[PDB]
């Protein structure tokens, strides 16, 4: 059976949060790195100096670390994920 919840949010006025912490895993973005507004960074993500992440990209570090190095770019609609092993 599919039993819905009356309280589930249909429209969230805040939109999707760009920075999704996961416990103590907080995405780290360098002050001189460009991250597009609608990008999602979750968990163990590090974005270093001079790098850029463009519109619609998703970087989900919930199983392992994700690192974008110096002056590197992850372009539009890329998905970057990782596994335990």
């Amino acid at each position: 059976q599919v039993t819905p919840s009356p309280d589930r949010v249909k429209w969230d006025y805040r939109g999707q949060r760009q920075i999704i912490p996961l416990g103590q895993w907080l995405p780290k973005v360098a002050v001189d790195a460009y991250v597009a507004p609608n990008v999602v960074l979750a968990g163990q993500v590090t974005v270093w100096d001079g790098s850029s992440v463009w519109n619609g990209a998703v970087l989900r570090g919930d199983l392992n670390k994700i690192t974008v190095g110096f002056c590197s770019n992850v372009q539009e609609r890329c998905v970057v994920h990782a596994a335990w092993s």
Partner: protein, 75 residues
Amino acid sequence: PISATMVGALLGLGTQMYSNALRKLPYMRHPWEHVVGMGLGAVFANQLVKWDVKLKEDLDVMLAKARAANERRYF
């Protein structure tokens, strides 16, 4: 011309920008701080010039006393 106020204001503005750059921030990140820095630099440069004048004035008297003490030898 090139007054102490202008040199000091330029140095204060440069100080704020250099500080922003060192922190990898945009040059004009907090512009009111640039205004504050220009004011402080102008004040500091003017005060330094006045202090230099006063320092030369005191050194003059002190060298005068040293010279008198030395000249007392040939009496």
